[PDB]
Amino acid sequence: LTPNQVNDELNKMQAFIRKEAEEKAKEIQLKADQEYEIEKTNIVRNETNNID
Amino acid sequence: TYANYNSAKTNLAAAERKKTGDLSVRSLHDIVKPEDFVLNSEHLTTVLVAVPKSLKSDFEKSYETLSKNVVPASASVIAEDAEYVLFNVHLFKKNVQEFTTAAREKKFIPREFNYSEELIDQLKKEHDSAASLEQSLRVQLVRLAKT
Amino acid sequence: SQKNGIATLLQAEKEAHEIVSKARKYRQDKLKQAKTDAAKEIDSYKIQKDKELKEF
C-alpha cells in the first residue's frame, strides 16, 4: 500500500531526525571536551604566572 | 502628472496580472498561509506548488517522482487555475532537490513562491497601495489638467 | 492532515536538538566551573608555596 509505503517513508524521515540528534549530541560532546581542555589550559597559565 | 499616471497604471496592471494564478503564484489574499512557506521551513513542515496536468492521479504521478525523500504525502492539486492543477502540497526544504523532482519529471511546471505571513501582508499592502496610487494619481492629474 | 507524521518527526527532531543544545550550554557552564576550580586549586597551591616560601 502506498499510504503504508508513505508511513515507511515517514519513518525513514524520522530516521534522518535521529541521525540529526546523534550528530547534535556528538557536537555537544566535542564542544564540552574542547571547552574543558581550553579552560583548564588557558586559565592556569595566568594563574601559574601569578603563582610563580 | 503624466509620469505619475503612467506609474500608477503600471502598478494597477501588475496588481491585476499577479492575481491570476493560472501559471504563477496567485493573490496572497486568496492564498493559504500555513504549509505554504509560512513556517513550513527546514524539517518543521513542507510547502510545494506545481501544475501537473489536471488530475490528482497525475499529481500523484508527479509526486511519485520525489522518491519520498521528505514530505512523502501525495500532492493534492485543486483550483480553478486554467481549469487544471494548482497545488499547495508538501515538499520539505530539506529535500529541495527532491521537492523540485516532485514536479520536474512530470513536466508539472512548478510555480512555488514564498507566502509567509509577512509576505502575504506585504502583497496585500502592495495591492492596496497600487489601487490608492491609481486613484490619487487620477485625482492629481484631473486637478493638474483643470489648472 | 497528511502531514501529521511529518509534524511528529519534526517535533521529535526539535526536542532532541533543544535537549542537545541545553546539554552543550550546561557543558560550557561546567567547563567554566572547571576553569574556576583549576584557578582555585592554583591559588591553593600558590598559598602552599607561600608557606613553602616562608619555609625558605
From Swiss-Prot, chain C:
Quaternary structure annotation from Swiss-Prot or TrEMBL: V-ATPase is a heteromultimeric enzyme composed of a peripheral catalytic V1 complex (components A to H) attached to an integral membrane V0 proton pore complex (components: a, c, c', c'', d, e, f and VOA1).
Modified residues (N-acetylserine): S1
UniProt-annotated location(s): Vacuole membrane
Family to which this protein belongs: Belongs to the V-ATPase G subunit family.
Identification of the protein by name: V-type proton ATPase subunit G
Signal peptide: none
Function: Subunit of the V1 complex of vacuolar(H+)-ATPase (V-ATPase), a multisubunit enzyme composed of a peripheral complex (V1) that hydrolyzes ATP and a membrane integral complex (V0) that translocates protons. V-ATPase is responsible for acidifying and maintaining the pH of intracellular compartments.
Full-protein residues shown: 2 to 57 of 114
Miscellaneous field: Present with 2280 molecules/cell in log phase SD medium.
